[PDB]
DNA sequence: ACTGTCTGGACTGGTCGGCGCTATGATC
DNA sequence: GATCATATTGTCCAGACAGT
C-alpha cells in the first residue's frame, strides 16, 4: 500500500486544520513551527491517524 | 466517444455536455441557458467548472480523496 | 425533525421520564457548573416529581399490562391512562370523548380495577 | 374623411394640436378635423381625406413623431365625442387607484358614487381606520371590478 | 465623518492647501476639501496621494476654471534612485 | 488598492495541478465568500428578516425547512440575473456528509 | 405527552474533543445542539439520555471536525391536540391563567375556565366564582385537555398552548372529587 | 484664513482670502494663475 | 448544520412565482427625487434593497452592504413574448393544433416517441435529435389527428413577430399577425401529457410561461446606483431600460383604460414588446439596440451574462482575489529553486493567519508584540469568537497580553512560508508553483533561474 | 438527394498608466 | 427668475433553408 500525492496532501491538510483548532500533536515539536510543519513531521514519523477510503 | 467525429467547440464535445453551467460558461451562454430552461434540465453538478462557479470542491485530485478518522486519539 | 431519521418511537410515561430527568440531573451535578440543565428541563423535572404518582417500575408494569390486556389501544393510550390513573367513569369519559372509541361501561370498569391495583 | 393617428410627446398633445391648427389656418391645408382627448396620452386623431395630407400637415413639427399607417374606424372614436360623466361605470365595492389629488398614487375602495356632483367617495385600503374621502370622478381608475 | 486621521492633515495650511517642499506619504492629504452632505455634517472629499506613492510636494497652483470655481493643482515630485527591477 | 485577477487560465492550471482546496481558498474563500438561506421545498432563495428575526421562503412558505449554504457572491448575482431573465434555478440541497 | 425516541444522526465533533471518548463527545455535542429547542414533528426536546452505537468518523473537505453516524436516545415532550393533561397553576393574570404541565406553560381563558363569570381578584391573585363560590388559588392541581398548539417558532417560550376547561369533569382536583360525590 | 500668494507671470506677492474669495487673480497684472510660496520652516533633505 | 447544493434544477418562472417572490410593485418610472431620497413605488424603492449607507431596507430591515436584495414584479398591461424562448415558441406553434391544443401526432406515434424517450437515457444530443424529428414530423401535418380541425402554416419573423398564413373565402392567401395574447391562449390549451413531446417540463416549463405577463424587476443590489464626483447620481443601464419599460407600460395601461382604438393599443404593445426584448437582450438581431441619451448602447442581462467581460467568465470562472501581490522579477541564483524573493514591503503587507497553539504561542506573541511596523510582526488578531482587531500602537501590548490558545494571528510573511508564484499567461499547469518565502529588503521579486 | 445562400457566433490572458462622458424645452 | 415630466425605436466556420 502506498499514498498518492493527492491523498497525502488531503491528509496533511486535514491534520493541519485539526491542529489549528485543537488536536494536540502526538509527537514532539520544535517550539515555533506552524501547524502545517507539525502535520509534515507527523507524516514523516508515520504516526498519522487519518486513513484513506478507497472504492472497491 | 459517440461514434461520430465531434469538434471541441460549442457544436462538439462542449455541446453535448450534460451540465448546463459547463455549456453556459464556455460558449453561447444565453441560448444554452434558455434551452435548458425550456427543457427543465437538472444539473447534477458532477463536473469541475460548475463546482468552481458555485464554490463546492471540484471532483478532481484531492477533491476525490475520502478520509476516515478514529476519534479516541491518545498521544 | 430530530436527526436524519427516527428508528423507534415510544410514548413514555411520567415516572420513567422523571427517572430519566433525575439521571440527567445527576449527570449535571457531576458536571462542574452548578446548573445541571436549562429552565425547561428543570421545570419538567420539578413537575414530574410533583406529579410522581407511581414508581417507574410500577408504571412500566401497568403500561405493559394495559398493552397486553387489549389490542385497539396503543402506547399513548396506556401512557395517558397510567398518568391520569382513573377511578370511575367520569375521567374515562372526559378522556375518551374526543378519541376514536367511546368504551363501553364493562371495559371501562375492567380498566378501572386494572388501574386501581397497587394504587397509592 | 378617414381617421389617422399622430404620435406626439406625452403631456403636450393640445399644444401640438394647436400648432397643427395654426399651420392649417395659415398654410391652406386640406385638413378636415383634429381631435385630442385628454384621456388619451401622447397621441392625437386627425380626420383627413388621405394620410399624405396628415404627414404633410405634421411635417415641420419636432413634437410630432410619425403617423400610423392604419385608418381608425369611426366606431372606435365615436365614444370619445359623447357627453358622458367620468363617474359613470363606477360601482361601490370595487378597488380604484387615484391618479391625482392630495392622495396621489394611492389605492382605495369605492363606497359612495354620485353623478350629479361629479365626485366619488373612497376609503383608503392602507388606512387602519376607515376614513372616507371625496375625490373627483376623473381622478380615479378602475383596477378590479367587484361588488 | 470621514476623518482620515489627525496626522494626515499635518502638512495642510489654514487655507486647506499643502505647503510646498513638504514630505508626503501614501494617503496623505494635499488639498483639504469638504463636500455638502447627501440627502448631517459636511462630507470629506480631500485629494490625497496614492497609497503606494510618496515624494515631496514640488509646487502648488491656485487658479480658476471655466466656470469661475477655484482649482488647485499640486505637483509632487519623488526621487527615483535606480534599484533592482 | 485593487486585487490581482485570478483568471480562467489560472483556475485551469490549478485544476490541472489537482489542488481542489487551494482553488476553493483562492476563488471562493478569498474573493466573494458569502452565506445565503435556501428553502428545501422549492429551492428558492429564502428571505431572512432581522426585525422579525426569522427566516422564511416567500414563494413557498416553509418556515422550518431552511438551510444555510456557503457560496460565492458571484453565484448569487448569477442566480439573480437568471431570475431577472425569467429563469428559475432550483437549488436542491444535499447534506455535507 | 412525553416521548422516548431512538434517533440516528450525524454528529460533528470538533478537534478540541478528540482526546475525549467518541460517545461522550457526541453526547456533549448533541446536548449543546438539540436540547432546549422545539421541533414541529417531535415537540420540546427535553434531554439526551445516552448514545447506543457510534460509527467511524468521516472528515469532509474544508473542515477539520469529524462527523460520526451515531444512534442515541432522546426524551422529548410533544403536546397533542385534544389530549388531557394534569398540571399546576403557576401564573394568573386577568385575561387568562397559566398552568405548568411540563416544559411548556398552558394558557386557560378566563371566559372559558368555567361555565360561570369568574372574577379575578387583584389583591391576592385569586379567582372567585360568582354563583358556584369556588376559589382558585396558586398551587392548585388542575386537569385540562389542549385545543390549540402554536408551532410557528422553534423557541419553546414563543410557542403558545391553549386548553379547554369548560367541559365537565375538568378543573381542580377538589372540584373533580365533588363532582364524583354527586355521581 | 487669508494668505499670501506669488503670481505666475509678474511674480509679485498677491494677498487674498481663499475662503471668501469672489475671484482669485493678481490685481497688479491681471494674471489669473497664482503660486503658493514655499514656507520658511526649515526642511531637512538627506544627501543622496 | 451545513448543507451544499447537490443539484440545480432549471425552469421558466411562472407569473404566480414572480408575484410571490416580489416584495413590492413598481409603477413609478423614477429612481430618486430632488433631495435624493428614493420614491415609493419606484425602481430604487427600499423594499427591493438599499445601496446608500444611510438607508435601511424595508423588506428585511438590514443596512447597506448586508442586505441581499429583493425582487419586484411589474404587471404588464398586455402579454409580451419573451425573445429567448420566442423561436422555441414558434416550434410549439408548429407542433400543436390551433383548436384542440394537442400535438399533431397520432396516439401510436406519441406512445412510440415516449418509449424512445425512455429508452435512450440522458444524452443531450439524442434528446435534441428526437425533439427536432418530432417537430419536423408534426409541422408538416395540416390536419389534427385528434380533432380534425384544419391547420395553417406559421411564419416566424425575427425576433417576436408571428404570421399565420390564412385563406379567405375567395381563396386568397394572406398573413394574420398573431398577437402575444393569442399566442399565450393557444399555448395554454396544451396539456401536460404533450409537453414531454415538445421538450417542456409539465411542472417546470409550461409553454404559457414563455409569454411574459409579469416582468420581474431585479433587486436594487444587483443593479446598484452610485453617486459621481459631481454630485449627480449615475444610474445603471438596466435601471434606464426598466424606467422605459415602466413608462411604456403605464402609457399602455392609461390608453387601455381610456378605450383607445386598436391602432393605439397594438402600437403601444409593439413598443412594450421592443422594450422588453431589448431588456432581455440588447444585441438581438433585427432590432435597433437601446441607446442612452449620449448615443451609447446599453448592455442588458444577456450581455451581463455572456462575453469575456460577462459574469460567467469575468466574475465566476475567473475573479480577482485577496492576499495577492504583483511586481517585477529579477534573477537570484543564490536562492534555491524552492525559494522566491519576497520584498520586505510585500511581506509586511501580505499576512498569513496562524492559529495560536501550544507550540507556536511564544512566536505569535512576539509577532503581536512587534506590531505591524516592525518585522517580523502582525497586522490583525482574530479571537475564537470571531471579531477581527487591527493592531495599532495603543493596543499592541494589550492584545499580546490577551493572547491565548485558539486565537488567530495574521503574522507577516516569514522565511519558509509557502506561497504561489504565477506568471501570465498560464498556458500549462507548470506556470504556477509553490515556492518558499525569502525576505530581502529590496523592492522587486526574485526567482531562481532554472 | 445535392447546392448555393442566409443567419448566427467568436475573435489569447494579465498588468501599469491616463482621458473623458453619462439633460432638456416648457411652465408660473 | 426656479421647477418638471419626458427623453426614438470584417473573416471564417457551422447550422438551417429554398431551389433544382
Ligand atoms: Zn419554499
Ligand atoms: Zn501678477
Ligand atoms: Zn433587504
Ligand atoms: Zn387539434
Numbering used by the authors:
A (entry chain K): 2 to 57
B (entry chain C): 314 to 388
C (entry chain F): 1 to 120
D (entry chain G): 4 to 150
E (entry chain B): 783 to 821, 834 to 879
F (entry chain B): 1027 to 1123
G (entry chain E): 1 to 183
H (entry chain P): 2 to 49
Can you quote the paper on this entry?
pmcFttA mediates factor-dependent transcription termination in archaea, and is responsible for transcription termination at the majority of transcription units in archaea in vivo. FttA has a bi-metal nucleolytic catalytic centre, comprising two Zn2+ ions coordinated by six histidine residues, located in an active-centre groove formed by the interface between a metallo-β-lactamase domain (MβL) and a fused β-CASPase domain4-7 (β-CASP). Archaeal FttA consists of fused MβL and β-CASP domains preceded by two K homology domains (KH1 and KH2).
In FttA(H255A/H591A), two of the six histidine residues that coordinate Zn2+ ions in the FttA nucleolytic catalytic centre are substituted. This double substitution abolishes FttA-dependent termination, FttA-dependent endonucleolytic cleavage of RNA, and FttA-dependent 5′→3′ exonucleolytic cleavage of RNA. The structures obtained using the two synthetic nucleic acid scaffolds are superimposable. The structure further shows that Tko Spt5 bridges the TEC and FttA, with the Spt5 NGN domain interacting with its binding partner Spt4 and the TEC, and with the Spt5 KOW domain interacting with FttAprox and FttAdist.
